[PDB]
Each structure stands twice: as C-alpha cells, then as structure tokens.
Ligand binder design. Sequence first.
Ligand SMILES: [Zn+2]
Ligand SMILES: [Zn+2]
Lengths: 1605, 53, 37, 40, 40
Amino acid sequence: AGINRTDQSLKNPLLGTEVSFCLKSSSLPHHVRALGQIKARNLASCDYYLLFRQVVLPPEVYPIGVLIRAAEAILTVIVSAWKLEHMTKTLYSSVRYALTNPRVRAQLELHIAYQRIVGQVSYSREADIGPKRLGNMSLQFVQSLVIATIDTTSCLMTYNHFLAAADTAKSRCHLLIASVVQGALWEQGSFLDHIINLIDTIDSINLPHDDYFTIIKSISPYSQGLVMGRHNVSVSSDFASVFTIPESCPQLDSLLKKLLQLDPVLLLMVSSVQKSWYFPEIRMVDGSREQLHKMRVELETPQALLSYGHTLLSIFRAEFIKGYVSKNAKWPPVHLLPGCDKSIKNARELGRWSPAFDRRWQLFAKVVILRIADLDMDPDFNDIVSDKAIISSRRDWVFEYNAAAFWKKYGERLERPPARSGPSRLVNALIDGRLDNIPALLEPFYRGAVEFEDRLTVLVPKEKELKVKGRFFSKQTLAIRIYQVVAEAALKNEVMPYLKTHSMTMSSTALTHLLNRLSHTITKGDSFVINLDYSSWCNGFRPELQAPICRQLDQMFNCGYFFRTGCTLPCFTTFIIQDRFNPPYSFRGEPVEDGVTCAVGTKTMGEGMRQKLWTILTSCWEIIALREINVTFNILGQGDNQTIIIHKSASQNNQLLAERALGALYKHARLAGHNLKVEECWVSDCLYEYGKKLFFRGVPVPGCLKQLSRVTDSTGELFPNLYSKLACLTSSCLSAAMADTSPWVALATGVCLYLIELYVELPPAIMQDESLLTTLCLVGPSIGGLPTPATLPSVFFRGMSDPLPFQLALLQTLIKTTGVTCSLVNRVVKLRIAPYPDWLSLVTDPTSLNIAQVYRPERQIRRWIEEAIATSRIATFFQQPLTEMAQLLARDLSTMMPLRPRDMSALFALSNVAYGLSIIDLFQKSSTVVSASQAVHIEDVALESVRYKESIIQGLLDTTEGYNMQPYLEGCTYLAAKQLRRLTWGRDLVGVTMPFVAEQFHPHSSVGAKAELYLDAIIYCPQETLRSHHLTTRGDQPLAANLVKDTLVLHQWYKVRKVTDPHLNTLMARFLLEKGYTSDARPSIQGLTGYVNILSTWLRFSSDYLHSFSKSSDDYTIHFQHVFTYGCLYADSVIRSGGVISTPYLLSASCKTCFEKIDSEEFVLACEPQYRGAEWLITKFDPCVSASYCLGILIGKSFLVDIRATWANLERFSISDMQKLPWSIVIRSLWRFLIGARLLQFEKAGLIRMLYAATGPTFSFLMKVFQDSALLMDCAPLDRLSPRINFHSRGDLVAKLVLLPFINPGIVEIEVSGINSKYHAVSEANMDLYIAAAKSVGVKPTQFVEETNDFTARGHHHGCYSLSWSKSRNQSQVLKMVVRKLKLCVLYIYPTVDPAVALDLCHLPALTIILVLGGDPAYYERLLEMDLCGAVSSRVDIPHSLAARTHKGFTIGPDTGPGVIRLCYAHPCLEELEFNAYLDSELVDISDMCCLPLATPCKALFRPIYRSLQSFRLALMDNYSFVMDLILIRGLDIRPHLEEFDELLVVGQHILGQPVLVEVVYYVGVPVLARHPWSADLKRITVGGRQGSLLVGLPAGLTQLLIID
Amino acid sequence: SIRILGENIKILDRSMKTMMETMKLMMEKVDLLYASTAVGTSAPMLPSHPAPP
Amino acid sequence: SIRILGENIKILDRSMKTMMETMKLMMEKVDLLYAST
Amino acid sequence: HSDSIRILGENIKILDRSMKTMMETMKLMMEKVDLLYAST
Amino acid sequence: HSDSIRILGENIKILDRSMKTMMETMKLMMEKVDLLYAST
Ligand SMILES: [Zn+2]
Ligand SMILES: [Zn+2]
C-alpha cells in the first residue's frame, strides 16, 4: 500500500523510539510483524553496534575481481590522461591492497551486500520482504524496521539504524580505502594497521553506551590536549587531564599515547574522523536536554552585560570611524558633546586620523556614525539557491514525523502528516507569488513585525559529526531565510571592508596577509596564538548582552528596526527537534515546550544564523579584553572558533603575559555571557583552527579522512537512479577537494565507490565484463553518458572550465591504451542528436550540447512544475512560457556573424528573459532535500526507476551503435569539440573552447629536456628540496539596479571600442525599456585552490608565455590560474608519491594547434528582435587620457595610505592594458594629487622613510607596471627630468618621481599649466571602462631600445658609466667588453651574479640572452625588475633560458669551471681594472673593447654626472633644498638621506675646487650646513670614505658648503 | 545685510549638524535595552508604525 | 547668492524631515519596553 | 528680485513650521522616556 | 527688496531660538536616557 524505505543513504536522526514502541505496548500490524521475528536473546536499539563487529562473511562471497581489475584499468586511464606514470602505481596498488586485505575486503564486501539489500528494498510498497543472507546474519524488513540475527542473537532496529550500519560499512570503506591510498601517498608509513587496531579497540569496549560514546566524542579534544601538553613551550594547560580516557579504556589510552609518540599530525588526522564507526545515535533523552539547556543558560547579571555591551559599542564606533576615514578618505560627521574630547573635534576639522585614538576607545562613546548608505532590500540571486532546506510555514512541521509514533506516544494522528500545506521548497515558495516581492516581504522585518508563521526553527541532528549528544543545525521559515541572506549580504558588502578585523576575513589578500602574520608569529614563537574554542559560542549569546552591533548598523543603512529584529528573533523563533519516529506533542497545531523534544523560545538562534553580526561581537570583546591589558593583537574569527595572535611586550614575559591575558579574557567574557572553564576555553602556542582546518604549528592536517568519509543527503529532487548517485558522488568528491582534500585520494575513492555503485544497481551479465565497466566509467555527462568523478577537471581546478576536450581525451585514452574497440565505445554512448537546435540550452549552458541522453532523468521539467504551481504575479511569470522568447532571442543571436555563446549568454543575462529562466531553473533545481520533487508523484517514478534500469541494461547490452564518434575522436580535440558543437547546433561556436591544460601543457623535467627542442612554457622552481614537512609549513614566497548598471557596462563597452549596430542598440534600448528606464543613455557605470597553495610558497612562477601569445595585442583562450594549479598539483603528486622536488620542472606546450586566438571582431545581429519589451517580469575627449588621469590620482591615493600604516586593488588588472595606456598624463596626475593633498609634517616623514627602500605593495605594483618600460621613455616629464636629478636605483627613481611635488617646487611650475578641470570630474569607475579603449584603439608601446654603451672597437670617451652609484662599475664594464669580444649571439649567465649587473648586459643590441636558470624565473624576474627601458623583455630567450639546466656555452656565474665567464691598465675607456674577467678559466685582456657614440641612454648611465654642468648645478641646488625641508620635517631622522646628499656634495666638491677631506666634521643644525660650527646647537655628523660660473647664481647655503670649514 | 544673515544661516547649519548627531547618539542607549529585555516566553512584539525604505 | 542660500534652507528642511522620520522610529521601542519589562 | 525674495520667505517659513512639529515630537518623546524608571 | 530681507532675518532669529530650545530638550532626554542604562 504505502511506499516504504524511502532513503537510499542516511539523512535522518537515529533514535530507537520506534523500537521502544514496537517492544512496548503496540497493536499496529507492523509492530506485530517486527515482534514475531526477533529471538529470545535480543540486543536493544542502543546496542546495534555490538552485532556488526562479530559478523564474519564467508570470504570472497562476491566475485568482485572484475571490479578490482576495472579499478586498476580506470585509474590507469585517468592518471595517464594527465600523463602521470609515477602516481598511477601508488593508486592501483593501493586499491588492490584494500581489495586484498581481509578486514578491508570484509568491510567492502559487507558494504556491497548492505547496499545491494538497500537497492533491493528501496521504495518497496510490500510491507515484509523475504529474509536475505548478509555475511552470517539473516535480514528481514518490515515497514521501516529491520531484524538481523547472526546465530542466536537478534537486534531489532529502525531502517535508519540499518542505513547507519550500511553507511558505517560505507564509512569504513571510505576510511580504509583512503587510509591505504594515503599510506601509499604520504611519507610516513601506512596507518591502516592503526585503524584496524582502533576498530578492534573501539569495538572491544564493553561499557554502557553513553560513557562509551563520550570516549568516542572526546577522542579528538583529548588528543589535541596531548599535543598541547607536549608542545606548549610558552604556556601550561589543563586541557588533556580532564578527559577520562586513561581511566575508562587503558587500551585506547595506550593507542592514543602511541599515536602521540609517532606523530601529532597523524594523531590529529585519526582524531578528525567523525562517525566512521557506528553512528552514536542522537541521544535525545539526555543530549537534547543538554543542548536545549546550553541554548538558554544565564551566566551573568544584566547590568554588567549591558555596560560591557556599551563598551563594545565604544570599540565598534571607534573601529568603524577608523575604517571610514581609511576608505572614504574624509571624515564621517562627529558629535560635539559637553564632555567630549577636543582632540576628536580637531580630528574632524583637520580631516586626518589621530594615532592616540587607537589606545583610547572610551571617548568614541560620545561620537557616532551618520547614515552613509541605503539598505538593499532585494537580495543577491546566487546565494539563496542551495545548501539549506526550509519549512513553508508553521503548518508544515507535521510532515517530518510519523503518525504511528504520535499514535503510540499520545494517541493522536499528528493532524494529517501527508498534507503538503504549500510547496516545501525554498525557491518554489519564494517566487510562488506570496513572497516574490522581496522589499514587501522584508517590510514587516523593516517594521520589525514578524509573522507568526515565520517563528519556527527545526533543529536537526546531522550524520557524520563526532559529537554524540547531537549538534543540530538551523532550519527556519522562508521569510527568516530571506532576512538572513539580506542582512548578511548587507554586512558583507559594506561593513566588513571598513572594519580592520573583518576586511581580513573577507578580502583574500588581507586574509593571506593575516594568515602570514599567523604563520611568522607561530614559527618565531615570540607571539602566542590562542585558539579559544567555545563549546556554546552559538548558544552563549543572550538577549541582555548580545551586544548586537546592530543598533549602529541600523542607523548607517537608513533603515529603522531591521537589524535590531535579528537579536530578539533568536527569542522569537520556536525551536523544535526533528526526531525520526519521535514527535513532539502538538498542542493546537504547534509543539508544546517540554525541554526534551521542543523548546518554545531560546535565547539564541542556532548555527549559521546571525553569523556576520556575532563574529564582529566576539571580535569586539576580544579587542576590549586585550586593550585593557595593553597588548598588541590580531583576531581571526571563524564563528564558533576564534584564533588570536597576541604579541609579546617588553613589559611582561610570555608566560606571565599569557596568564594575565587569559585572566582578562575570562573576566571580560564572563561579562559577555560566555562563562568559560579552563577545560572549555584554552590557550595555545601551537594549535589553532580557522576555516574548519586545524593547524598545529602552522601544519594543516589533511581532511581526506574526514571529507571523503562525509556523506550528504543524496538522491534529491528526482527519482532514485544510478545517474545522480554517481553525479552526487562526483559532487561530494568536488566539495571535498575544494575544501583541502588531496584530489588523488578523492579521485581514487570516487572510482572505487563508482564501481561499487555499478555493482549494486546492475545485473551480473554486465558486471562480468571488465571492458564494459571501464567504458561505462569513462563516458561522462557531457556527451551522452554517466557522470563520473573522473570527468570533471573542476576537482583539480576552479569552477569554470570546458569539459568537452577533457571528455574526448578520456575516451581517446580509453580506446588507445585499453584494448577496447571504438565500436564498443559507440555502443556504450549511442550518440543521438536532436533534429532541431534547442538554443535555450546553449544560452543557459555554453558547454552543453544539443544531444538528449536517456540516462539523464527525463522529467517534463519545463512545464510540469509550472502546471503544478498553476494548479496549486505567478500568472504573469507563467502564463507565457519564457522558453518561447528565449528561443526567439537566441535564434536572433544565432544570426551573429561570429557566433559566441559566452556573448549570447551575456546578452541573455542582460534581459528579463534570463531572469524568468532563472526563476524556472530554481523551480527545477531547488536544492532542497527530498520534500519537493522526490516526495511528490512517487508512484509513477518508481516505474521510471525500473524503466531506467531496464534502459541502461538495453543500451549496454545491445551492440547497435548510435552515431559513429570515430570521426570526432580522430585528430586533435579542440577542433573535435568545435565540430561537434557545429554539428549539433548547425553553426560553428567561437569563444567557448577552453582546452584541457594537460593536453595543452605536458610536464617534463629540466634535466630531461633539451632547450632548442622544448617549447614555450609556464614553469616552477623550488627554493629547497621538499618533503612532507614542506607540504605543510609555509615558505618565503607569497600566496534590478545591478541589471541597469550591467546594461550600461555592456552599452559603454560597445561605445568604447567604437562599434554601432542599429539592431544591437535597438535590442539594448529594449532591455532598458523593459527595466523601466525610459532614457536610452544614462551617464553611469596567486591564491589558487588553497589546498596546494602552501607548496607554492616554496615555488616561484611568472607568465613566461610572452614569446607566442602576449606579443600580439589580441587576447587568447589561456587561463593562467589553471596552468599554475596544474603545476602545483604535479609537484604535489610527485612529493606524495615518495619522490622529492629538488630538480625544477617544466610545463611545456605539446599541442601547438590547441591555442586559439579569440577573434578581434564585433558581433552584428542580423535580425531585429520581436520581444517588444515585457515590463511584467520586474515588479518595480578621448577616453585614454581621462583613464590615464584617473589612474595617476588612484595611484596617489593608494600611496597615501601606505605611509599611515594595493589600496584600491590595482593588482586585478592586466599589465598589457596598462602598458597600452599613455603614461605621460599618469605622471602629471600622480604629481598633482600631493599638491592637492598638502600633508602635514608627520606624513611627509613617512613618505621619505618608506619609499627610498624597496617597500610597499602599491610601490611594488608601480614597479610591476614599469617592469618593461617603454612607458618611461614616451613620458614627457622623464626625458626632461633625467638630466636634472640623480636617479640612484629604480626604487630611488620612482620614489623621487612621485615625491617631486613635495621635494621640489621648480619641477611643479613646468607642468602646472597641464591641468584640466573636466578631467577632475571623471570618476574612477569610468577608468576600468576606458582602459578597454586602450586595448583596441590604443596602439602598443614601441618597446624602444634605449641603447647603453655598445662597446665596439674604439671611440670617444663619453663617461662609460654602468651602476656607478653603488655597485662596482668595472664589474659590469668588463662583462660588456667580454661579450662584445667573444661576439656571442647567445650568452649564458647563472643566478649567482647580482641582478643589476646582468641587467646591463641585456641593453646591448644584437645579443640574445639565454640565462642558465635551470627552471627558475626568479632571476629573470629580478633582472627584468631592474630595467628602465624595457629592452630586457625582448633580448632574453625565455623558452631556451627557462628550461635549460646545464651549461651549454659561456656561463657567467660559476666561480671556477671550464666554459665559465668568471670574475697599470693604460686604457682610455676605464681608469682602473677593479674586476678581472676570466674566460674558460683563463685571463684575457679586456682593454681592446672601447666605447662608441650612443643614442639616448637607459638609466645605467646617470645623465647628471655626464658632460652637462648646468643640470648638475641644478642638482646641487636641489639636494640642499631637499635637506633644508627634511630637517624641518618633524619626526624624521636624516641619517641615510644626509649620506645621499653628502655623496652628492662630494661629487660637487670635485668641481667646486676646494680640497675634499676624507672625514668631515660637518656640524649640522637648524637649517645651516657647514663643516665649521656656526652655533653650539649644531650637531657633529661624521662622514667617511670621501670655472667660477657655478659660483654665479649660488645660494648662501651652498656658499657655506663651498669653502671647507 | 545678506552676508551677515548668511553667516546666521551657517550658524543654523552648524547647530543642525550637531542636532543630527545628538539623536543618533541617543537612540543607541534604548536600542540596547530593546535588545536586552527580550526574554521571550511566548515572544509577541508589536511595533508602532510602518516605515518607508 | 540668494538662490544658493535658498537651496541651503531647503536642505535644512530636508534634514528636519529625515530626523522626524527617524525619531518616530525611536518611538516604536520604548512602547515595547513597557511590555517586555 | 521680485520673484526670489517671496519664495525665500516661504522656504524659511516651511522650516519654521517643520521645527515646531519636531519640537512637539521631542516633547512627546520626553513624555515617553520618563516612564523608564517607572518600569525599572 | 531689502525690507522683506529684514523680515526673514527676524524669522532666521526665530529659527535660532527654536534650535536652541530643541538643544535644551535633547539635553534633558540625553540625561534621562543615559541614567536609564546603568539599571536593568
Ligand atoms: Zn590542438
Ligand atoms: Zn632598461
């Protein structure tokens, strides 16, 4: 009758309340059939774990050797598709060894038997199925209850307990397979033996279940306590000694201590697994009362809580005002309180931040933040869609529980539980028409009135969490979910970038910087890292001190009583406990509060609710508690777990500082409503966890034991089938490997469970043939087959990729390597094309083809859900099928002259049509659990399940082919993908071809490579030999209105490249008209994947593709993050295989055809649209110089904040477009910002201090744009400036160039006339628009050779200078003369030479440079970073230099060797021979090569010391004028700058005629400068190591500097 | 006559910026007692007036 | 100069309108403080 | 200055009407906030 | 038209008087609301 045994995997809580109902006082027939099958010796529902330990199976009961050989074949094809023969053996030998070890094979054949029984009882309407033999037990299933008996002892359980047994065998299949693979893929030995001993120990504990599972829960905190108690050099902690593991189980204590003595990291990985053993029920009778109590505990008096919360308001106002001054660069309005400090009012009027405000937060209790922005009522569309189910109202709570349990507990039938009572999905009820008007939805929340149907939260225990009393997650109503999304988006968009604590937690660059501050301060050991884990962080927030920071948040966003709703709303919502077959009693349709099954109103909201508020609140109490004790500190706040860097002060020792800090934290956090024990909240200097990743001394433990053994709900929103079981396994491996799991272990486990899932749901005729299993594995979802964990490269890379060449490469490797004919592949695939193009599936998914596979679940999809919601503004959305307008618009887009599906999808997403299709797609894929499409219409889709099983049987067994895929699979794969796209769509597709990067780049090693053979390559190089410790410890090298705005962005993108199409502009105007805007024109606008990034801190890389693709102005279809990630994963795979990365390697191109230039062609639409607008789907001067002028002032305001501590994120721009921009205007705009700023005495000191040294992220960016400098020569200030001042280094040159308005008024008056008022009015938000005009209209920079001294034969002496300011000039002089003497076309230089010396060898014309890098781009990056003319980028042969390890010619850099250039003399060109250059370990006279007349010179020659004296006299005026200002600069110690000015003074004193003293007494005071003392206040400065027209027009200070003493 | 009166309007504006700040201080003391006393036995709270965004 | 201070007195009126709307949002919570206490 | 002075007087008069209404609001809110120690 | 300028200048003086008597009552309801928050 009723359909039974719904779930195929566990997604429900585990209580034997149904078992207690069957065992006590029942009369229903299913309890009668369950009581009749149990034996006399019956284990209870708590003791199901004792049954399955004793279960031995008759060995090799399933002949799964076909699956073993298939796993070896599949994994061989996968890891040969990446062309990796070393890591293949460590996978298939490990997979074989798991399938050979008797305990692991016993668990896996147990799992095959379990899931075969599940697949034979899933959706069985028959009440009792026959007894089936599993191992040695006999299984019998009645209703939702399972009876298992081994020999004489039976165990009655629910079907969720049987699924917990099945998923426990599945979990141990995960854990043992991943343990054998990890022991194969990690340098320490295989811990499979320790897992077997741990399983035997955990199964051998004969204790009562609650204390037993307390041991199982506390296996991880006690292990962390052991690691702490062994490795706390700075502190002493009582964290380990509380847990009773030595007293309850001596064997497990011995095992844990043994694991401690082997490796703490491996102990943490073994501790990290959650429910790989038997699922520890949910323990409602004690554990739920614990949780419902932890929620509502009261720990502190309300007066102290409110006083401390107002102190939190003081610090939050101080931090947000600091953020607003730092970001908006102007002050927010400041109150004038009688009793306010006058310093705050003076800081308001001056417009600058006071350093004394940091340690004095209390005065900010008088000063608030005025309204700065408006609240966005409509939410972001992407974050509402997934990862959380809802309840529709308060009437939909009865669906989760069983009516029979309510009948046996209270005698009632739970008010019709099969009543649906509205659509239970999130987004189906969201745009149902009730709640589609989101501003009117949150208008009650804007009023603060909450609907009675909203206030209900369902608390659900989750499978696979190591806690045993049951951690619950929050499941609220739709309106509260929309409220949470809007509030968290409003905090993330605006509040977090201002706050200095949480701009770290949002911005990835600041997160990297703060994690680096974590890493350096934990490796030095000076600053301690406390990990303050709160047991009830989600439950410790109170109504009295939630200290919600919401008050102020409400005033800044121009709303009233919106954010203040979200602190009382923890107490508004009624919390109920979802228990399977254990319902809370219904009073009047609502559950009644008992303290066990339901708690009507708790003082907190749950987990994941009000997260963004509560993180800032916790950070506020940590800032107060640590600034009352005067320490320096940084906070990372994950939420429930907190990590604080605290720096050691000189006043207190480290242990005393930490004990005082913990006393202060306990005192203030007790006033924060979080009463903390020593065992609950603990100090550390080694262990800290942020972002759900545990670090011990900066070593992250691999999560491969935890997230691989992590099951989701699965089979959601469809009929149960093989296709989405394999696709859901693929998504589980994806979500594991994005969140720090090794992709090789995840891929191998996915292959093994893929083959097990094939074994469960296929007849034995298929399963006896190895070739058919391999070919069924390697088809993929894109071309007409089953989804596989093999077929996504997104497991190894970012989210966006083109799967199609990778699918073709997997098939090609299947046909070529494994002995399978192509006709067999066509038999498996059966390629059937659609007769007509379904263009909507192209514009929604660019990579999707026109073909229709039968393995995909064929629900009606487009209209079935629409007919369901029509039967049950919903009319305006769904009276017209939007696929009609979508197909008409996309047919019009198909009449493009070049066809680009990315551009078609972009112009689709501009329309309201794609908004309607996204409404439809969320009605298709709601991502809720079971309750919207899995539950609805279940009778007619069980027949579809059997039909799809028979269909895959018929398709696999029938050898009749579909379309012959041999023409596609022959030849190259990118053309094959494009031709398949043309053949299924009827028209060729351009712009969507992203080739497989391993097909594109196939790695080798530099010692295995030949330089002239090998191609253009994007490679790495390590700094040390790497091992297991090097994978873990970090290294040196670093790591709607919006629719209207995007419509304007694409319209101005059309306008900026100067293309006008009447059809395209007409269609874009139609888009503006349907959005409600009448006017046609409106004037308005190295992180990698994180898993493998730690290895990349030891590695170095750059974009070395410039010899094939970057030299053209056209862009290409190369994604460089994917190339870098592939190189990191190859290094990671070689390390984990057992070898080491000592020799640097290479990623060289193998498929030269596969690189596709994207066409520089605009698209013209041939056909006018027939859309005519909708208006129902929505309810309510040349640009190059302006972009240059915005770029200059943007660099100026970026440099402005660096002296206070890029700023405007300038690093997210391509270097090529910046090189296209004219940089004459940028330098004038950079100069004028400091004139317009007029900074005070203190900031001008920092401008001198930090920029003469090579420091600054903005400074490094402006070096990066000037890395090749044709921008420097074409700039009109700089050819004038180069005679004037003495540029010392490039770091000196750029710093002098930016600070010229501050240091010299003379240069300002030359360029003061080039000011324009309308260029001030051009905003920065147009600049990233206008840089597109640089891309197409803007010509490339000339890359001109600013020729230095070419040194051929003889010539007249012009000075012959090369780094004469600091370095030994003769060292580079003799190198230029040696390479001209040898007449080398090709020159070799080792990285031991100073990079500025090997810089000057690249300015010689007709000299190809092949540096002996051996793999290292760092040396070439340094000597590219030293140039000022850009000629180094043209004469260094990067593919020959970058991949060559050994010496192949004349090498500069070895100290002694064959074929090695190594480092009186009456020579006119050089006055002396400082360095003797030896060739072939032999001395050769250098003097024959002399100078020549030259062109305009690069910055190696230093134009001021050349023949011109008037510019050097101007320089002698300028440096004394600099020093007179800098003495007057307050807080600036002029020791190095006085030394620079004194070097200029000695260079002047050679010309002034007075004798030069070697040591000058040089009395310095205020400013006057002379050797003789003018007055007593002058200070002696010790400098060692040291016509008449210049006297005309000489200042009096230089007259003092003229005469000695 | 116009300029001295314009200075008086500047005094009006300088006091008005202070008046904008006084109320914005003075919400945040009863804001936290509305936050505080939310003990939530049955949790009904009825706000006074509707508000436009 | 008359029109400049004419707009300047109008923005002074707009600020008073916004303060009145915000201070009536202040009213809705002491009313529920009389019920929650 | 036939048109500017009259509308200037009206634009000052509308603020004169507005600030007395907010003064009445301030008196009403003073009446509300004197009940705070009547509850606590 | 300088006579109406003097009339609206007197109105500016009335606006100044109203702003001062709003500062007074805001100070009183500053004091009362601030002495609320210590007791709860
Ligand atoms: Zn190719
Ligand atoms: Zn250069």
